[PDB]
Design a protein around this ligand. Structure first.
Ligand SMILES: [Mg+2]
Ligand SMILES: [Mg+2]
Ligand SMILES: [Mg+2]
Ligand SMILES: [Mg+2]
Ligand SMILES: [Mg+2]
Ligand SMILES: [Mg+2]
Ligand SMILES: [Mg+2]
Ligand SMILES: [Mg+2]
Ligand SMILES: [Mg+2]
Ligand SMILES: [Mg+2]
Ligand SMILES: [Mg+2]
Ligand SMILES: [Mg+2]
Ligand SMILES: [Mg+2]
Ligand SMILES: [Mg+2]
Ligand SMILES: [Mg+2]
Ligand SMILES: [Mg+2]
Ligand SMILES: [Mg+2]
Ligand SMILES: [Mg+2]
Ligand SMILES: [Mg+2]
Ligand SMILES: [Mg+2]
Ligand SMILES: [Mg+2]
Ligand SMILES: [Mg+2]
Ligand SMILES: [Mg+2]
Ligand SMILES: [Mg+2]
Ligand SMILES: [Mg+2]
Ligand SMILES: [Mg+2]
Ligand SMILES: [Zn+2]
Lengths: 63, 51, 132, 343, 109
RNA sequence: AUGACCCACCAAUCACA
RNA sequence: UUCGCCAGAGUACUACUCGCAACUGCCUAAAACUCAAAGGACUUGGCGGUGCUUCACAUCCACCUAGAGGAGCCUGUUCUAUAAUCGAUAAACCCCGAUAGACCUUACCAACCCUUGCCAAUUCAGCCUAUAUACCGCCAUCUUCAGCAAACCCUAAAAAG
């Protein structure tokens, strides 16, 4: 059918790959459009860990 | 066995198409009897034949 | 729990006739009477006779037309004649149906000593009211 | 005594005793079995053992263009007819007592390893006949209910794949075994992974993963060395299309954690092209059977480095004492060398 | 442990097999002192025919008689072997049927 | 205050030539 | 980077040792034998002489009215009793199967009788014999309680919610 794993890859990844495997027999619109002008970052899932220890953020205060 | 259930199978040195099945393709070694499942008699027969 | 003349709820696949889907407390409210005769009225006689006759007719008909009876029989009694009316699955060739019509009507006429009519209504498959 | 009798349905319902309280709490054993046989199966309208022939029923209405009269068969003719009917019963008993063969998965009474056959077509008409499904684990599972007390659900864990690199697993649970099978199939097709296969037989590189309490450790084999693995992993591999592999599972062998762990692991493979690109170098493969000849597997599309990799005299890598023990011939277990059947 | 501690203990060594009722021999020969009966443990019940034997090692021990029916009197010599009977607590030996004075079980006549 | 023991889920169809 | 510890459960903070101002002691610490588990965390139930809210409408307390439990009878149980039925037998039995036993009913007891012995046919009729823990049929009960359940979907895994 498709792949409902949100965590495994980008939608791009899963889609292209599922086509590659010959499972998904029709290319979806947004695919060609995607290939043409892809986003800046791969939209792959990531877990938001809380920082610990001495670590802090990098954000510069504006003065 | 595979070999002795079908009596029309003959183990000779001559049919290579049969013997070929009992050798590895890549490694060129003869399968041991359990891998295939032939009975020890025919496995020995085969080994000699392939020789 | 009252169990009388009920068809219990199954997993939800069970085909159920209009008749079978209505518990006794619905008689004369939603479903009607499978028989009609004068006997049970206030000032009237021989209820018992007609009851036995009825029972025998249901049994007899059920055995005479094996497998082809759709719903329970309808027995109308009018001025000494009984019209039996049945819902029948199409199973037999019309030869067998007419054979059994004639055979029955004559047989029962000579048994109960009154003219007996038989009316067959034919149906593709059991009419389904509910679930399924 | 004619009024005293009943319908067949009533009598069978009576005799079978499926609706009793014995069946519900499992108050009786499963080796005790009785069945219902239709008693109208072989009978024809008009047929009786008195031997009559009725114009509309047993025999055609018209013979030679005239109306056949009511007539009766000869004694021996009825003998033959009853012989026929008896032989029919015996034939149906011969058909009934023959039990169809069940292809055995892992063991005879295990459902594990068994094929369910292709999942069902999706609502869009989309059809997978290319997919097979194998059962990994079927389990009777219970829950304590206010009214019923113990309540028994089956839950099955299943995997599908086309052999071409797309496989996935899912779990499904229901009161009836049949029902859970259906559920887990149709659900599996929704979570598919793509497994990158090197040269379409092995994985790309060695994998070691600790998923929860399960450690899988897999090693990449050459072409001839078929599928040496936990039996579940062999099943899943056969579904993916991975033909040559070695995997040792340690810690808890719990089935769901094993297949989750496995898919996680295989998903996270880093292809030779990916490696080529992130390092920006040629990745070159030295076969042993091909000698010193440098087969170039992957080249970094884009700009290649002119910078060599820092040469580390001695690498710092995590080593597994198992592999080291294997390399030096300190694994003496009588269970390891054993000859097994083909993959 | 650490590498020092593992150096200091040596590698782990497999403890020798502790020895059982037959003292590591496959059978023993012994004379019958008494024939009696023992009930099994709780979940499942019968009354099991056992004897007491004295064994060539001089040790005296309860032993169990397989099969249905038997003829055994005091002073009969039997040959006993190692299988432990699961019901009977304490009974670790079994008479060998078909040797010396314990004959094979006679088929019903 | 008390209330022998024992109780449970491991088998597969029908129909046609 | 180290050191100290840990190889199923019991037996066992025990028996024997060595040492100790300890002499019913501390420390160190087994085995026979017994078991096929022992453990850890969770889940849904059920339960709680646990807490907090909200209730009870003939209903628990507060309260109203008429009765039962004491008498005679009537009728049913239990016992005891008889040669002399059976069934119900906490709530959910006890003027209950019975809107009905002098013979019949009737199943019981005692004497006697009859053996293709209700029917078109049948090496067969017949059985108020045993099993309600094999059952259908009818029901009781929680209950004037609000839930049961197919088909799906979701959950860094799913027992279940
Ligand atoms: Mg088997
Ligand atoms: Mg037992
Ligand atoms: Mg034994
Ligand atoms: Mg001898
Ligand atoms: Mg007491
Ligand atoms: Mg108790
Ligand atoms: Mg350990
Ligand atoms: Mg111990
Ligand atoms: Mg202490
Ligand atoms: Mg002490
Ligand atoms: Mg000591
Ligand atoms: Mg009151
Ligand atoms: Mg009064
Ligand atoms: Mg009073
Ligand atoms: Mg009184
Ligand atoms: Mg009584
Ligand atoms: Mg009785
Ligand atoms: Mg009683
Ligand atoms: Mg009760
Ligand atoms: Mg009387
Ligand atoms: Mg009398
Ligand atoms: Mg009698
Ligand atoms: Mg009951
Ligand atoms: Mg509702
Ligand atoms: Mg969770
Ligand atoms: Mg749910
Ligand atoms: Zn052979």
């Amino acid at each position: 059918a498709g792949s409902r794993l949100e965590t495994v890859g980008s939608i791009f990844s899963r889609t292209r790959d599922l086509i590659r495997a010959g499972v998904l027999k029709e290319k979806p619109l947004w695919l060609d459009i995607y290939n043409a002008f892809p986003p800046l970052r791969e939209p792959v899932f990531r877990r938001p860990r809380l920082r610990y220890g001495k670590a802090k953020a990098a954000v510069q205060d504006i003065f | 066995c595979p070999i002795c259930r079908d009596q029309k199978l003959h183990v000779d040195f001559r049919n290579v198409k049969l013997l070929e099945q009992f050798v590895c393709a890549h490694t060129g070694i003869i399968f041991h009897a359990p891998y295939t499942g032939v009975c020890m008699k025919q496995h020995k027969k085969l080994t000699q034949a392939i020789q | 729990k009252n169990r009388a003349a009920r068809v219990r709820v199954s997993k939800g696949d069970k085909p159920v006739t209009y008749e079978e889907a209505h518990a006794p407390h619905y008689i004369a409210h939603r479903k009607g009477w499978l028989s009609l005769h004068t006997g049970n009225l206030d000032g009237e006689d021989h209820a018992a006779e007609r009851t036995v006759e009825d029972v025998f007719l249901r049994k007899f008909m059920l055995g005479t037309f094996p497998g082809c009876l759709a719903d329970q029989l309808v027995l109308k009694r009018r001025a000494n004649q009984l019209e039996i009316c049945a819902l029948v699955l199409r199973q037999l060739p019309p030869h067998k149906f007419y054979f059994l019509v004639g055979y029955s009507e004559t047989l029962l006429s000579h048994f109960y000593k009154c003219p007996v009519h038989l009316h067959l209504q034919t149906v593709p498959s059991k009419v389904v009211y509910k679930y399924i | 005594s004619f009024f005293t009798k009943l319908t067949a349905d009533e009598l069978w319902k009576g005799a079978l005793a499926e609706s009793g309280a014995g069946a519900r709490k499992g108050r009786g054993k499963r080796t005790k079995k009785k069945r219902r046989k239709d008693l109208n199966r072989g009978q024809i309208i008009g047929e009786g053992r008195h031997g009559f022939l009725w114009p509309g029923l047993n025999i055609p209405l018209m013979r030679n263009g005239a109306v056949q009269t009511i007539a009766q068969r000869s004694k021996e003719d009825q003998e033959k007819v009853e012989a026929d009917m008896v032989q029919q019963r015996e034939e149906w008993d011969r058909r009934r007592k023959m039990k169809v063969k069940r292809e055995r998965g892992w063991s005879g009474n295990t459902w594990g390893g068994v094929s369910l056959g292709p999942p069902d077509p999706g609502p869009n008409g989309e059809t997978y006949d290319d997919f097979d499904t194998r059962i990994l684990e079927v389990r009777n599972v219970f829950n304590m209910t206010a009214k019923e007390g113990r309540k028994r659900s089956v839950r099955v864990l299943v995997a599908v794949g086309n052999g071409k690199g797309a496989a996935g697993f899912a779990i499904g649970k229901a009161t009836e075994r049949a029902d859970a099978f259906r559920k887990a199939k149709n659900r599996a097709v929704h979570y598919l992974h793509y497994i990158e296969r090197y040269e379409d037989h092995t994985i790309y590189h060695d994998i070691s993963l600790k998923f929860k309490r399960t450690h899988i450790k897999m090693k990449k084999q050459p072409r001839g060395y078929g599928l040496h693995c936990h039996r579940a992993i062999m099943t899943i591999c056969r579904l993916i299309g991975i033909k040559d592999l070695y995997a040792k599972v340690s810690g808890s062998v719990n089935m769901l954690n094993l297949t989750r762990g496995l898919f996680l692991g295989l998903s996270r493979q880093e292809t030779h092209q990916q490696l080529a690109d992130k390092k920006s170098l040629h990745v070159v493969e030295f076969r042993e059977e091909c000698g010193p000849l440098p087969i170039v597997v992957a080249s970094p599309q884009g700009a290649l480095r002119k910078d060599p990799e820092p040469e580390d005299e001695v690498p710092d890598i995590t080593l597994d004492w198992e592999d080291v023990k294997a390399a030096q011939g300190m694994k003496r277990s009588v269970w390891s060398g054993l000859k097994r059947a083909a993959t | 442990a650490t590498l020092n501690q593992m150096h200091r203990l040596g590698p782990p060594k497999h403890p020798p097999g502790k020895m059982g009722p037959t003292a590591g021999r496959p059978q023993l020969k012994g004379v019958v002192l008494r024939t009696f009966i023992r009930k099994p443990k709780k979940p499942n019940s019968a009354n099991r025919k056992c004897c007491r034997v004295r064994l060539s090692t001089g040790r005296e021990a309860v032993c169990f008689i397989p099969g249905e029916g038997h003829s055994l009197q005091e002073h009969h010599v039997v040959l006993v072997q190692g299988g432990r009977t699961q019901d009977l607590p304490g009974v670790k030996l079994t008479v060998v049927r078909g040797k010396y004075d314990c004959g094979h079980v006679q088929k019903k006549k």
